[PDB]
Design a protein around this ligand. Structure first.
Ligand SMILES: CCCCCCCCCCCCCCCCCC(=O)OC[C@H](COP(=O)([O-])OCC(O)COP(=O)([O-])OC[C@@H](COC(=O)CCCCCCCCCCCCCCCCC)OC(=O)CCCCCCCCCCCCCCCCC)OC(=O)CCCCCCCCCCCCCCCCC
Ligand SMILES: CCCCCCCCCCCCCCCCCC(=O)OC[C@H](COP(=O)([O-])OCC(O)COP(=O)([O-])OC[C@@H](COC(=O)CCCCCCCCCCCCCCCCC)OC(=O)CCCCCCCCCCCCCCCCC)OC(=O)CCCCCCCCCCCCCCCCC
Ligand SMILES: COC1=C(OC)C(=O)C(C/C=C(\C)CC/C=C(\C)CC/C=C(/C)CC/C=C(/C)CC/C=C(\C)CC/C=C(\C)CC/C=C(\C)CC/C=C(\C)CC/C=C(\C)CCC=C(C)C)=C(C)C1=O
Ligand SMILES: CCCCCCCCCCCCCCCCCC(=O)OC[C@H](COP(=O)([O-])OCC[N+](C)(C)C)OC(=O)CCCCCCCCCCCCCCCCC
Ligand SMILES: NC(=O)C1=CN([C@@H]2O[C@H](COP(=O)(O)OP(=O)(O)OC[C@H]3O[C@@H](n4cnc5c(N)ncnc54)[C@H](OP(=O)(O)O)[C@@H]3O)[C@@H](O)[C@H]2O)C=CC1
Ligand code: SF4
Ligand code: SF4
Ligand code: SF4
Lengths: 155, 176, 49, 55, 318, 45, 342
């Protein structure tokens, strides 16, 4: 059946996507320190296929770790627009989610959402390195439930 | 009391110069660096198999918030607004009103979990141990709105993590 | 003297995980093969070791 | 998961020191996570007399 | 029976680099107390396939300021050069029995650098041109030592034919007669392939990219697979040239098993040094070769022209 | 009962070293060169 | 107005506009802009989608938290349409497709779907339904796109009487398939203008002008039942319009004359592609067909808006198509092409 063939093919692509996420570190504030602890051998982010890779031309997901200051807000959008785009954005910490501690400041945007679309939200201040691992695991589940080929077959 | 970290003058005798020359040509400190990387290769990796092996925590851990209730069943919050008054990030919003039966509780108790700093000041300020930070730290969500907890979601957390929060404060109340 | 014990210990894991079929089950779904005593069982089916 | 002596000799020699004595992994020397309840002391001002705040 | 032979080389080669990326992280992790990929398949035995399949399905894009033609041909240059270079390697019997196999590999390996800056120049990026200009003078200065080291060692061969190394080190390993040249040969191989005492070509710490600056799923995969293939060979070339093995003419499988083992051990050392040393600054890596490697290079050359003459050990030309 | 808080053991904790423990290993300078030259001489023969 | 629908604020994101839009097919060209304009004013837009949720990600950061709600809907299902429009003030129709899918032809997506949307909206009890149809909508034009659109707007008018109907001429913008379509024709050798494109007359309209036109129609009280026609200020002959595109893009120009029947054949050849087709036979007819002036219908200006000339917003679309030799050229280097009297 055509639907079955597109079903297996979609799963193959989705497996290839979720099993290789290459974060482009936007290390901004104390949320970045905890994320490096995820890369530390205690949790070993690398072991899940997900390994840190620079050059957003060669990265799949953004991990917004820290406050997003209005001065650098154009930089966040520019590095987001340059990713080969099967692409997702992970927001770490209360500050990146909706402003957090500095929600009422004059120079902190109330959440990274106002600049970029945001996938799974990671709450914390900072979210423990284990909590982020759960977040990345959630994105892998979200990638697993992608029906890109099924929608194309039913267009 | 100070110590000179780098004030070592090498000896100029025929022995020492040859060793430095032998170190130079026959790369030794590079081999010592190589030799020790081999030592760590054969060692025991410290990686914990997440999520089958969750990390070690303490009873004082601060995570997802929850409102607890008395053993009778009635909530502990009596709407003194101490938690809202001391919240450093003003993530707490409270609205109270006389209940039908008398003793009155909150009609709105919203915690902005994207504005919360998880400092734990709310659970200290609470004179009835009503608002606490539970042991959960895996409540990541796909949408920003799902983080903005209100009274109903928080009360649900209190009725879900009660079997764990009760033991934690049971082990830590004496320290406080 | 210890390599043979190591292989026997490694071979014992296939008997520990309910035979070879169970061994691949844990390997392909839990990424570990280490056996351990069963401390308890919860109502939802999770096995704690 | 303490390894075979053959590795221990190789691992020790490659690093140049006895690694089995002091290890990076905590096996059992850690304190038990279920400790007996404590009895916190009191401050110097916890007195029933001659403890006026004006002083 | 030649297309089968060629495809019995291309597919194993691309699969060798394929799982070298797995034995990279799984070795790098274990040397930094991590565990490496062990999730995708048992022990990570499927992680590179997951990596590769993603890197041929995620959106590729030419830079807006690119030069399309030179941007596309550079991955062609890198991959074809890497594959074509394995051709005269004398695994028992070489696939192509070149009379001047050594000179061939020198010429094409000197060509694998046109890919790096044609990619850099066409990308029209500030980090691209910097990385391109870093790499070219890096390789050619390291190439002068590469040529002389090969010549000095091969003076005991009597020819440039790769097959004759089997006969030359039949009783005694070549390294025992040219170990001083072996050390600089290994360092130069670390430098031509841009591993990480001199990975400044990538320069991720200071140049973020440079192997593949805006290069994406396809072209990034090539520029990776074109340099990891060079990793395996430059140790296979080191293995064949210095550490010979017994070769029974009736059972070549023993030699292939031995030859593969030496390449595997050498490749691990390439990964081993990669996580045990800092990054050479540009002037340092140029100073190391132009001011310390070359003076020893010429001196040991003159030794190896004279050595067969003084000992009456001129090797047979045939 | 009496006050009970986290306290050091009655005799105090054991010593904790802090100084550099870099060992000295390998042959002296002449020995390394001699074995390096000796290998060349045997290899040459 | 309902107690929770009274407008509040100063028009910002957190301001309560008071309109609950239900923009259909918002995962597209105009759908992106109309949601944005609704997003700025603080309007709870119920955006239904049938595509992958990932393709709707760009829609998320255009409204305050809880404003933009994503719902799953299917074209051939009354229940899905009812679910999305049950609680709404205004329903915006933007479903369309320049080609005929295997499961959806021009008949299905321009008459059947608008019929269900209009009929269900009236049963639900919405106030305004803004339906969009081509300006060149005609019952006898050979291009089934125009033919289907004419049937649909008449049917939608019957089902929903006071349903404002928009008739834009031809939108141009960042992803328009109108300026991009002509600029993309460099690959296929030269540009094969039908009859050199010396007879076709077009009146392109800026996409942003259409978007604000829709929003102004929503707030306008007189839009009930009217049938608007959105056209750009100037009016361009096809050959000169393509001249302006390639001059702004700084690309070589090869005016290939190509017979109409032959063009219909190559449109058939490109139609075979299972994926997004480069062009269809119906597309060839559309660019060959002109945009007739309809002065009787109220224009864009009547919706308190000023049209934007294409020569003012041309570099927006064609800066990308320029190579590095012309990636930094200014805006006024290329002057507007011939302007046939409007
Ligand atoms: C050079 C490599 C030679 C072969 C491997 C020898 C080896 O390291 O054996 C392990 C063994 C013990 O290693 P260790 O790190 O000290 O073990 C610590 C714990 O006991 C480790 O405790 P544990 O409970 O984790 O040990 C159990 C473990 C034990 O696993 C093994 O013993 C694996 C190797 C044998 C199979 O088995 C498993 O975990 C089951 C999964 C096995 C994975 C696949 C192994 C593939 C082996 C190679 C196949 C062919 C390629 O090695 C030695 O005793 C030294 C061997 C020296 C060989 C020199 C040859 C010249
Ligand atoms: C020696 C023969 C050189 C022949 C020649 O004119 O090469 C131009 C060629 C392209 O120059 P470019 O600076 O990339 O500008 C391309 C577009 O003009 C500027 O970029 P573009 O985005 O316009 O590129 C697409 C463009 C140009 O076509 C391509 O980019 C396709 C590949 C190059 C075709 C020539 O397509 C067309 O013009 C229509 C093609 C039908 O420059 C070369 O260096 C290629 C030489 C290849 C020699 C044989 C190698 C084996
Ligand atoms: C600073 O330092 C740095 C480095 O290092 C010094 C680095 O390393 C790195 C790299 C980073 C890391 C290692 C970190 C982790 C990252 C990764 C692991 C990235 C992984 C990247 C990959 C590219 C994945 C690689 C993995 C795999 C599994 C690749 C697998 C390969 C394939 C799927 C393809 C294999 C080949 C195939 C199938 C060939 C098939 C061929 C055929 C069928 C035959 C073809 C030929 C013919 C038919 C011939 C006949 C035809 C004719 C004659 C036609 C004639 C035509 C005419 C017209 C005449 C970085 C960044 C760096 O910063
Ligand atoms: C070796 C790899 C083996 C498996 C390869 C499967 C094919 C993957 C191709 C990349 C994904 C796109 C695809 O499959 O179809 C494109 C199709 C193209 O048609 P489409 O309309 O679905 O494209 C996405 C939607 N737009 C056009 C708005 C961007 O897209 C999808 O399937 C994605 C949904
Ligand atoms: N010049 C022009 O193009 C003009 C166009 N219009 C009208 O504007 C409308 C939108 O145009 P535009 O945004 O450019 O079109 P696009 O093709 O860019 O977007 C069409 C939208 O409709 C949805 N859609 C189409 N067919 C179906 C279907 N069968 N089932 C479900 N959803 C469907 C699409 O979903 P998905 O993205 O998943 O495919 C998408 O949201 C159309 O009605 C068009 O005729 C009016 C005047 C001028
Ligand atoms: S959320 Fe907390 S930890 Fe994260 S950046 Fe803000 S203040 Fe720092
Ligand atoms: S822990 Fe969070 S909710 Fe409690 S006082 Fe601190 S910031 Fe407020
Ligand atoms: S501090 Fe406790 S009792 Fe007081 S308002 Fe907050 S939750 Fe209620």
């Amino acid at each position: 059946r055509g639907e079955y063939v597109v079903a297996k093919l979609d799963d193959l692509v989705n497996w290839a996507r979720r099993s290789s996420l290459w974060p482009m570190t936007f290390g901004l504030a104390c949320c970045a320190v905890e994320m490096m602890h995820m890369a530390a051998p205690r949790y070993d982010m690398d072991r899940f296929g997900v390994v840190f890779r620079a050059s957003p031309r060669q990265s799949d997901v953004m991990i917004v770790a820290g406050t997003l200051t209005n001065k650098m807000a154009p930089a966040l959008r520019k590095v987001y627009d340059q990713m080969p785009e099967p692409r997702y954005v992970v927001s770490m910490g209360s500050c990146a989610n909706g402003g957090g501690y500095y929600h009422y400041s004059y120079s902190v945007v109330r959440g990274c959402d106002r600049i970029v679309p945001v996938d799974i939200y990671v709450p914390g201040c900072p979210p423990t390195a284990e909590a982020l691992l759960y977040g990345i695991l959630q994105l892998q589940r979200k990638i697993k439930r992608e029906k890109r080929l099924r929608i194309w077959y039913r267009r | 009391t100070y110590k000179f970290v780098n004030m070592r003058e090498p000896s100029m005798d025929m022995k020492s110069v040859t060793d430095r020359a032998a170190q130079t040509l026959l790369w030794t400190e590079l081999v010592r660096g190589l030799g020790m990387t081999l030592s760590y290769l054969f060692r025991e990796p410290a990686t914990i198999n997440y999520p089958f092996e969750k990390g070690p925590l303490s009873p004082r851990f601060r995570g997802e918030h929850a409102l607890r209730r008395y053993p009778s069943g009635e909530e502990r919050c009596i709407a003194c607004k101490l938690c809202e008054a001391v919240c450093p990030a003003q993530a707490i919003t409270i609205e109270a009103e006389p209940r039908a039966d008398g003793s009155r509780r909150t009609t709105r108790y919203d915690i902005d979990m994207t504005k919360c700093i998880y400092c734990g000041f709310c659970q200290e300020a609470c004179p009835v141990d009503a608002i606490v930070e539970g042991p959960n730290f895996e409540f990541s969500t796909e949408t920003h709105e799902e983080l903005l907890y209100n009274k109903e979601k928080l009360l649900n957390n209190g009725d879900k993590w009660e079997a764990e929060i009760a033991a934690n404060i049971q082990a830590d109340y004496l320290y406080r | 003297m210890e390599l043979v014990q190591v292989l026997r210990r490694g071979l014992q894991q296939v008997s520990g995980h309910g035979g070879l079929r169970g061994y691949l089950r844990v390997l392909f779904r839990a990424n570990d093969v280490r056996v351990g005593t069963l401390v308890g069982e919860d109502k939802y089916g999770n096995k704690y070791y | 998961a303490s390894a075979t002596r053959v590795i221990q000799l190789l691992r020790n020699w490659a690093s140049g020191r006895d690694l089995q004595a002091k290890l990076q992994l905590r096996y059992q020397e850690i304190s038990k996570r279920t400790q007996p309840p404590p009895k916190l002391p009191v401050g110097p001002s916890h007195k029933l007399s001659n403890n006026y705040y004006c002083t | 029976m030649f297309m089968i032979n060629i495809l019995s080389l291309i597919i194993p080669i691309l699969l060798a680099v394929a799982f070298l990326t797995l034995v990279e992280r799984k070795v790098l992790g274990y040397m930094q107390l991590r565990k490496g990929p062990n999730v995708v398949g048992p022990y990570g035995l499927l992680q590179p396939i997951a990596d590769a399949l993603k890197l041929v399905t995620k959106e590729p894009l030419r830079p807006g300021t690119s030069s399309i033609s030179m941007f596309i041909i550079a991955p062609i240059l890198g991959l074809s050069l890497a594959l074509t270079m394995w051709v005269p390697l004398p695994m028992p019997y070489p696939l192509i029995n070149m009379n001047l196999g050594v000179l061939f590999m020198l010429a094409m390996s000197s060509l694998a650098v046109y890919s790096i800056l044609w990619s850099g120049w066409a990308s029209n990026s500030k980090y691209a041109l910097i990385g391109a200009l870093r790499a070219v003078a890096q390789t050619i200065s390291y190439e002068v030592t590469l040529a002389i080291i090969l010549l000095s060692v091969l003076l005991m061969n009597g020819s440039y034919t790769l097959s004759t190394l089997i006969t030359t080190q039949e009783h005694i390993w070549m390294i025992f007669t040219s170990w001083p040249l072996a050390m600089m040969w290994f360092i130069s191989t670390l430098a031509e392939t841009n591993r990480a005492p001199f990975d400044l070509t990538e320069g991720e710490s200071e140049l973020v990219s440079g192997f593949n600056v805006e290069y994406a799923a396809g072209p990034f995969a090539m520029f990776f697979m074109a340099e990891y293939a060079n990793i395996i060979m430059m140790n296979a070339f080191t293995a064949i040239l210095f550490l010979g093995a017994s070769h029974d003419p009736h059972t070549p499988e023993l030699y292939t098993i031995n030859f593969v083992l030496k390449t595997l051990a050498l490749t691990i050392t390439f990964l081993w040094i990669r996580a045990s040393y800092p990054r050479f600054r540009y002037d340092q890596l140029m100073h190391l070769l132009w001011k310390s490697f070359l003076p020893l290079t010429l001196a040991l050359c003159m030794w190896h022209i004279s050595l067969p003459i003084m000992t009456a050990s001129i090797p047979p030309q045939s | 009962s009496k006050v009970k808080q986290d306290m050091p053991p009655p005799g105090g904790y054991g010593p904790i070293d802090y100084k550099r423990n870099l060992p000295r290993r390998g042959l002296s300078g002449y020995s390394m060169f001699a074995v390096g030259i000796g290998t060349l001489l045997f290899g040459y023969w | 107005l309902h107690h929770a629908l009274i407008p509040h604020g100063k028009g910002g994101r957190s301001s309560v506009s008071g309109i609950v839009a239900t923009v259909f097919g918002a995962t597209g060209f105009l759908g992106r802009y109309v949601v944005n304009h609704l997003g700025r004013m603080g309007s709870q837009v119920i955006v239904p989608y049938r595509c992958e949720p990932y393709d709707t990600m760009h829609l998320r950061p255009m409204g305050d938290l809880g404003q933009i709600i994503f719902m799953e809907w299917n074209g051939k299902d009354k229940d899905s349409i009812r679910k999305v429009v049950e609680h709404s003030n205004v329903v915006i129709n933007l479903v369309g497709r320049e080609w005929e899918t295997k499961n959806f032809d021009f008949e299905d997506v321009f008459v059947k779907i608008p019929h269900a949307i209009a009929q269900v909206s009236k049963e639900a009890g919405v106030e305004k339904l803004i339906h969009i149809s081509h300006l060149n909508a005609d019952i006898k034009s050979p291009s089934r796109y125009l033919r289907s659109k004419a049937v649909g707007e008449k049917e939608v008018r019957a089902a929903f009487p006071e349903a404002t109907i928009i008739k834009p001429s031809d939108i141009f913008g960042r992803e328009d398939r109108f300026l991009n379509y002509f600029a993309s024709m460099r690959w296929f050798g030269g540009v094969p203008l039908i009859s050199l494109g010396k007879e076709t007359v077009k009146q392109p309209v800026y996409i942003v002008d259409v978007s604000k036109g829709i929003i102004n129609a929503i707030k306008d009280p007189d839009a009930k039942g009217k049938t608007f026609a959105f056209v750009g200020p100037n009016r361009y002959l096809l050959f000169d319009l393509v001249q302006y595109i390639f001059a702004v893009a700084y690309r070589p120009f090869l005016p290939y004359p190509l017979p109409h029947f032959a063009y219909r054949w190559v449109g058939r050849l490109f139609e075979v592609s299972p994926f997004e087709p480069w062009t269809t036979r119906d597309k060839v007819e559309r660019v060959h067909m002109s945009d007739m002036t309809l002065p009787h219908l109220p224009g864009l200006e009547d919706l308190g808006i000023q049209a934007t000339p294409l020569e003012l917003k041309a570099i927006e679309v064609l800066r990308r198509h320029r190579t590095y030799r012309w990636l930094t050229s200014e805006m006024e280097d290329v002057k507007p092409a011939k302007t046939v009297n409007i």
